[PDB]
Design a protein. Structure first.
Length: 73
């Protein structure tokens, strides 16, 4: 028959880079750390991400999920 399904477009692929120094203000919220920590993340990881995320959760989560990559760092 027909399998249908035919769409999907414009998706946020790859993480967004962030230059050091300068950009360093409050943002990370406890609610988030918990929303992440609750999921099974580490406060630190949440913060670190939340940072690069720019106070973003939907993004941070992605970072938390795919934080440790195939590299030492």
């Amino acid at each position: 028959g027909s399998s249908g399904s035919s769409g999907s477009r414009q998706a946020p692929i790859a993480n967004a880079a962030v230059l050091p120094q300068s950009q360093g203000r409050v943002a990370a919220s406890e609610e988030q750390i918990q929303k992440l920590v609750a999921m099974g993340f580490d406060r630190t990881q949440v913060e670190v991400a939340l940072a690069a995320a720019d106070d973003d959760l939907t993004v941070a989560v992605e970072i938390l999920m795919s934080q440790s990559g195939p590299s030492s760092g």
